[PDB]
Amino acid sequence: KMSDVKCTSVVLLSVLQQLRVESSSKLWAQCVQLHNDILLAKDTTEAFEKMVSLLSVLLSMQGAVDINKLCE
Amino acid sequence: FSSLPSYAAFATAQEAYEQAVANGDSEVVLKKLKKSLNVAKSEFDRDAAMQRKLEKMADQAMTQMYKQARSEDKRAKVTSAMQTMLFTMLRKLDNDALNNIINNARDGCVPLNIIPLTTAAKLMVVIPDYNTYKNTCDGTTFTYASALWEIQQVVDADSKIVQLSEISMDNSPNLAWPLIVTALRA
Amino acid sequence: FSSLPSYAAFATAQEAYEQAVANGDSEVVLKKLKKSLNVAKSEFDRDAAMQRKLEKMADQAMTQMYKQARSEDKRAKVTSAMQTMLFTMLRKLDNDALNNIINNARDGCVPLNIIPLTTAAKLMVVIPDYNTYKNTCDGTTFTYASALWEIQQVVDADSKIVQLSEISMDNSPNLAWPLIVTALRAN
Amino acid sequence: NFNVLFSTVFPPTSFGPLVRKIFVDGVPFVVSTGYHFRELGVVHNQDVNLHSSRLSFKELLVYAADPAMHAASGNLLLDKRTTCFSVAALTNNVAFQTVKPGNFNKDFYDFAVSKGFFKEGSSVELKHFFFAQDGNAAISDYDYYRYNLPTMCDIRQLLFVVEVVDKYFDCYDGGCINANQVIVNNLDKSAGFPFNKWGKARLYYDSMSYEDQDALFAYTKRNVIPTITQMNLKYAISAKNRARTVAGVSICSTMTNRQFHQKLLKSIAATRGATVVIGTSKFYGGWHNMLKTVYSDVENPHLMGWDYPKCDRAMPNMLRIMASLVLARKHTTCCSLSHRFYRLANECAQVLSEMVMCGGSLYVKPGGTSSGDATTAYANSVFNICQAVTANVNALLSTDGNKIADKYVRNLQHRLYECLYRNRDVDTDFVNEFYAYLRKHFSMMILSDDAVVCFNSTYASQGLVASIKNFKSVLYYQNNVFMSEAKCWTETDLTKGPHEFCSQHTMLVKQGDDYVYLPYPDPSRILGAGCFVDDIVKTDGTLMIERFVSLAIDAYPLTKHPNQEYADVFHLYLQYIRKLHDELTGHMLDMYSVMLTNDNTSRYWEPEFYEAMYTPHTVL
RNA sequence: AGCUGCUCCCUAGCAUGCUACUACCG
RNA sequence: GCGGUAGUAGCAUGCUAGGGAGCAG
Ligand SMILES: [Zn+2]
């Protein structure tokens, strides 16, 4: 359960990086800090906090079609 | 590699020698069969080797070009495979707090800044219509990301502060509906 | 090889040999024809198997020659590039201040670390946070290295222009915060 | 040693290259003609020519690498992020460089999960990742040179430690070579600043004939050429979120340092059974041989290992100069006395206090070692041996001699004091005797700043050989660092090997008829290498496959571990290799109709292939 | 974007060597 | 019948070269 959240964090930062987010220094710094803090966590209750925080960044942009990728 | 022409020769003389070893015959006609087989096992043992190596040469060249094609085509689709994998993994993770914000974003309620973790700090969320306001807002409390927040201010699209009491079903078509709620974590 | 002297001899030798075999004259005829076509294939062996090392060696030489020509062209290209760079960077330092400080030396030798300090016409300052900005590049002009500089243009880590009225203590948390100031030397 | 102390009084702008104006073709240049060192004083070049008609290829090469023209034509820089000296900005913008995250190999992770891995409470879990960095990482990593401080040495003790250290290097041979005897691996790497604008090292090795290289090498024995070093961020797997950097040195420096040092370096890397073990492979029984050689015949043996905090940033300049002189002591018949001094000056001006290109700006390096020059791993070994010898000397001279019960050791102590503080020239007999004593009671095995020691415990409990506190004291007063005993280890049982050496653990196993020593890695390192990659290189296993063959070779010895969760790594890798082969063949036959005629590949998922790599009969 | 050391796989070339078959001669 | 030299085919060891990859300091 910890392994899954760490792998998801890696993939999430890759997606954020290829959406040209590092062109804003503050946002990239915060994203890097959250990604590095998730990978060093030892209990799986703060990793989910930081995952909510880090996924809100992707949810606040408009470069992804949420209705299409979530066809289930 | 028996489909080669020279095989028909190599068997032919060999067949002769079979008859020879069945006959028990003289000395010279066996020299015949030790002078027209060693020319057969030499005219054939050269054609049936280079072609055998050529088959594997063709196979390895085809594999090399296939490797190049697939590697070329894999790094042209990163931007779609990565998003598909991300959402598959998120769906498998099965978390309540993540599902809440994902479904809200699917309907239209999206945040405007990073969601804060401290009990302090300000949150701003967009509201596209009244149905989401009704099942999300209740009085002065806001349920978001499996957490509870207290409302501080509501506005509309023209940046004009709107008091909370007037937000209702009948007055709805009188406000610029992309509302922006500001709240603070409990 | 297909049209070398050994080919005609070997071909006619075996043609006559097998025509006489179709005649079938003697027992020494077979031995003689087979010896001729043993020594005439002993001509088509040296002349058709060792003749082919000559061509391979010539091709070795030709590929080496091509390689050497290409390596000789690349050297000229890089030489031109280097000397163009040297001459283009030369056209900026031949000022009158450099001549002054070189004619003030007792042998013509000076430390290099003082050449930008006393002759450069433009200064760049990199500032990490607000207190350091308030201590170094305050206002429109400031003093440094026994000179006085006047500010023009301020940018941030995103390379976007910032006005001097936005760098306050309240607006500080809204800036990308290495700041890069560019100033000109005042006379 | 005296210059080091006296140079702290004078302004820091008076050190570095000395420049002068020359007239090529009738136009004035600004070029370097000398140098002012903090340790060596003022040095002037011997061949300086005003009024030159035109420049040849090697004169252009020398003038392009000089920082004089680059610094004299740039802007003035005041950088408040660091405390180091800043010279100039070479452009109108500052560059901020980041590090990307890694790529996820989801197929391998799914396969591993479907075989019972990564369960809760397991003893094997992922701890090696690719960590990402933001735009402030390079300057914040360069700022660590603030831990280098001017250090004066005890000269009379150092002048004896240097003789013992030099005796540790007596079996080798060296000297200068010609340009057509130099061996270059990987001619497709970077060539440093200026030169990374136009090509790689291949272009500069191709454009210069064997006579141009000889002329440049002969030039460097009468003149000094300063250069510029570039700093580059690294992209690799790790366990800590610290950023790592490497130094890229110019081609003008490497080309000549190879001709100076390569013969001795290749002599060192080809010897078996000595103290320095650079070049010895761990395969086909090499680990066992190394361990049995280091065990020697010490009497009450224990094993010990220690640590160097901030090794490359904190090393003082006197020890680096000493290492260079020890290496150069092999040039007694090919070089004169002035040639050797100018070679030392060139090395100091290029890899000790050179100018550093970080971002797009030039800074001054206070000191330390640059990890990208042609002699790093051997200078590090010399430094290691020097510190160990110093610790032993300090341990022996600070013991009350009225309590030492052995007559021989008491006489050795008396003569050691006389040889340090009462004699002026070298005494070779006592150096022989002290070297023999050290080799009998203190055995070492050294790689470039890594070490294992087998020592007599009865002697170390009486103060006659170095303990682990002597190292702490020596590092405190000669290296300006505090070494904590939570990163050092001791071992009282020899049937278990060293606790750590080169990130490997040791284990004694029965193999055939006898018991041997085998090394094994950390399982999480292998699994992390399998799971996180840099695109295409994995995430499609069928295209490489050999990656997993190499990773299974590295992980074979885990099958002999008592813990059962450790052999599962080797068996998982074998099963994945078989799966990949089957999938590739299935694709190939379903899409052309093609079959590999004869496989000769089933050997890759059977363990005899991997077992044969650890048995003493070399088949490389 | 660096300096080294070790290892695995594929291709090509040459030399050497082994072995087998044809020819000449003694 | 044997020895030698000249040929053709297969196998073995190492030596150089080119390419891909893994580990350690
Ligand atoms: Zn020499």
**Residue D38 CA, ligand 1 centroid: distance in Å:** 25
Q: Judge whether B96 and A43 are in contact, CB under 8 Å.
A: no
D131, A10: Cβ pair inside 8 Å?
no
Q: Provide the number of CB pairs (under 8 Å) joining chain C to chain D.
A: 138
Which residues, 6+ apart, have CB-to-CB distance to D608 below 8 Å? none
Give the integer Cα–Cα distance in Å for C180 and D96.
13
Residue B162 main-chain phi, psi, to 5 deg: -115, 130
Half-sphere exposure of A55 (CA within 13 A, CB side): 27
Whether the CB of D458 is less than 7 Å away from nucleic strand F comes out as: no
How many CB atoms sit inside 10 A of residue C48's CB? 16
Interatomic distance C58 CA / E15 C1' (Å)? 20
Helices A46-60 + B96-107 axis angle, to 10: 10
Half-sphere exposure of C10 (CA within 13 A, CB side): 18
Nearest in space to D487 (alpha carbons), one of D495, D477, D475, D496: D475
Q: Report, in this order, helix, strand and coil percent for chain D, each rounded to 5.
A: 45, 15, 40
Contacts of A32 in chain D (CB under 8 A): 98, 132-134
Which two three-digit tokens encode residue D150?
A: 């001017």
Contacts of B118 in chain A (CB under 8 A): none
Whether the CB of D547 is less than 7 Å away from nucleic strand F comes out as: yes
Which two three-digit tokens encode residue B35?
A: 């002078």
Which two three-digit tokens encode residue D156?
A: 């009379």
Nearest in space to C86 (alpha carbons), one of D252, D350, D31: D31
Buried/exposed code over C64-80 (b: 16+ C-beta within 10 A; e: otherwise): eeeeeeeeeeebeebbe
DSSP B123-177: EEEEE-SHHHHHHHEETTEEEETTEEEEEEEEE-TTS--B-STT-SSTTGGGS-S
Give the integer Cα–Cα distance in Å for D256 and D126.
45
Half-sphere exposure of C184 (CA within 13 A, CB side): 4
Nearest in space to C33 (alpha carbons), one of C56, C17, C48: C17
DSSP A18-49: TTT-TTSHHHHHHHHHHHHHHHT-SSTTHHHH
A23, C176: Cβ pair inside 8 Å?
no
Breaks (C-N over 2.5 A) in chain B follow: none
Say which experimental method was used: cryo-EM
Place of tokens 């890069």: C180
Which two three-digit tokens encode residue C109?
A: 């030798």
Buried/exposed code over D429-462 (b: 16+ C-beta within 10 A; e: otherwise): ebbeebbebbeebbbbbbbbbbbbbbbbbebbee
Nearest in space to D415 (alpha carbons), one of D386, D401, D405: D401
Bridge partner residues of C184 (DSSP): C122, C150
Q: Could you tell me the resolution of this structure in angstroms?
A: 2.6
Element (DSSP H or E) covering residue D88: strand D86-89
Give the integer Cα–Cα distance in Å for B143 and B125.
11
**Cα C106-C107-C110 angle, rounded to 5 deg:** 85
Which residues, 6+ apart, have CB-to-CB distance to D258 below 8 Å? D182, D184, D374
Contacts 24+ apart (CB under 8 A), D549-555: D549/D577, D549/D604, D551/D526, D552/D577, D552/D610, D553/D610, D553/D613, D554/D521, D554/D526, D555/D520, D555/D521, D555/D523, D555/D526
**Residue D206 CA, ligand 1 centroid: distance in Å:** 25
3-state secondary structure of C155: strand
Say if residue D502 carries a ligand binding annotation: no
Q: Judge whether B149 and B185 are in contact, CB under 8 Å.
A: yes
3-state secondary structure of D41: strand
Question: Does any CB of chain D come closer than 8 Å to the CB of residue C25?
Answer: no
Whether the CB of D307 is less than 7 Å away from nucleic strand F comes out as: no
Give the integer Cα–Cα distance in Å for C103 and C170.
51
Q: How far from D492 is each of D455, D461, D496, CA to CA, in Å?
A: 10, 13, 9
Question: Does any CB of chain D come closer than 8 Å to the CB of residue C49?
Answer: no
Cα of D278 vs its chain's centroid, Å: 11
Q: Judge whether D476 and D485 are in contact, CB under 8 Å.
A: no
Place of tokens 């040999």: C17
Question: Does any CB of chain A come closer than 8 Å to the CB of residue D129?
Answer: yes
Give the integer Cα–Cα distance in Å for A47 and A53.
10
Element (DSSP H or E) covering residue D28: strand D27-28
CATH of span C97-186: 3.30.70.3540
Say if residue D335 carries a ligand binding annotation: yes
Which residues, 6+ apart, have CB-to-CB distance to D5 below 8 Å? D150, D152
D536, B75: Cβ pair inside 8 Å?
yes
**Residue D337 CA, ligand 1 centroid: distance in Å:** 10
Which nucleotide lies closest to D311 by the C1' atom and the CA atom?
F25
Which residues, 6+ apart, have CB-to-CB distance to D503 below 8 Å? D521, D522, D525
In three-state form (DSSP H/G/I as H, E/B as E, the rest C), the secondary structure along B104-137 is HHHHCCCECCCCCCCCCCEEEEEECCHHHHHHHE
Say if residue D488 carries a ligand binding annotation: no
Q: How far from D571 is each of D367, D411, D575, CA to CA, in Å?
A: 49, 60, 6
Test the A interface: residue of D108, D128, D241, D531 with most A CBs within 10 Å: D241
User: Chains touching chain D at 3 or more Cβ pairs under 8 angstroms?
Assistant: A, B, C
Q: Judge whether D35 and D43 are in contact, CB under 8 Å.
A: yes
The residue that minimises its CA distance to C1' of F7 is C45
What positions of D carry a catalytic annotation? 448-450
Q: Judge whether D78 and D86 are in contact, CB under 8 Å.
A: yes
How many CB atoms sit inside 10 A of residue D224's CB? 22
Residue C122 main-chain phi, psi, to 5 deg: -140, 140
DSSP D196-262: GGT--HHHHHHHS-HHHHHHHHHHTTTS----EEEEEE----BSS----EEEEPPHHHHHHHHHHHH
Q: Judge whether D79 and D86 are in contact, CB under 8 Å.
A: yes
Nearest in space to D340 (alpha carbons), one of D253, D255, D220, D426: D220
Bridge partner residues of D44 (DSSP): D34
Which two three-digit tokens encode residue D96?
A: 């901020």
Q: Are strands D355-358 and D228-233 parallel, antiparallel or unpaired?
A: parallel
Place of tokens 């931007």: B79
What's the gap in Å between the CA of D81 and the closest CA on chain C?
A: 6
Q: Are strands D31-37 and D41-44 parallel, antiparallel or unpaired?
A: antiparallel
Give the integer Cα–Cα distance in Å for D280 and D169.
17
Q: Judge whether B9 and B43 are in contact, CB under 8 Å.
A: yes
Interatomic distance D618 CA / E8 C1' (Å)? 15
Scanning D26-55 for CB atoms below 8 A from A yields none
CA dihedral B143, B148, B154, B156 (to 10 degrees): -40
Protein contacts on strand E: list nucleotides below 7 Å from a Cβ. 1-12, 21-25
C78, D27: Cβ pair inside 8 Å?
no
Give the integer Cα–Cα distance in Å for C177 and D170.
57
Question: Does any CB of chain D come closer than 8 Å to the CB of residue B70?
Answer: yes
Nearest in space to C97 (alpha carbons), one of C153, C150, C147: C147
Question: Does any CB of chain A come closer than 8 Å to the CB of residue B76?
Answer: no
Place of tokens 């140079």: D7
Which nucleotide lies closest to B46 by the C1' atom and the CA atom?
F9
Give the integer Cα–Cα distance in Å for C126 and C60.
59
3-state secondary structure of D587: helix
B62, D594: Cβ pair inside 8 Å?
yes
Cα of D578 vs its chain's centroid, Å: 38
- State the first-to-last Cα distance of chain D, in angstroms, to the nearest integer: 49
Which two three-digit tokens encode residue D40?
A: 């060596």
Q: Judge whether D227 and D252 are in contact, CB under 8 Å.
A: yes
Buried/exposed code over C160-171 (b: 16+ C-beta within 10 A; e: otherwise): eebeeeebeeee
- State the first-to-last Cα distance of chain C, in angstroms, to the nearest integer: 87
Question: Does any CB of chain D come closer than 8 Å to the CB of residue B1?
Answer: no
**Cα D438-D440-D444 angle, rounded to 5 deg:** 65
CA D197, D198, D202, D204 dihedral sign is negative
Q: Are strands B147-155 and B137-138 parallel, antiparallel or unpaired?
A: unpaired
Q: Judge whether A25 and D135 are in contact, CB under 8 Å.
A: yes
Give the integer Cα–Cα distance in Å for B21 and B35.
16
Q: Which amino acid is at B143?
A: T
Scanning A13-52 for CB atoms below 8 A from B yields 14-15, 18, 30, 48-52
Q: Judge whether D364 and D145 are in contact, CB under 8 Å.
A: no
Which residues, 6+ apart, have CB-to-CB distance to D146 below 8 Å? D83, D84
Which two three-digit tokens encode residue B24?
A: 């028990």
D74, C180: Cβ pair inside 8 Å?
no
Give the integer Cα–Cα distance in Å for D573 and D578.
9
Element (DSSP H or E) covering residue D341: helix D337-351
**Cα D560-D566-D571 angle, rounded to 5 deg:** 85
Q: Judge whether D326 and D174 are in contact, CB under 8 Å.
A: no
Give the integer Cα–Cα distance in Å for C121 and C101.
15
Which two three-digit tokens encode residue B101?
A: 């914000």
Q: Which amino acid is at A25?
A: S
Whether the CB of D370 is less than 7 Å away from nucleic strand F comes out as: no
Element (DSSP H or E) covering residue D546: helix D546-555
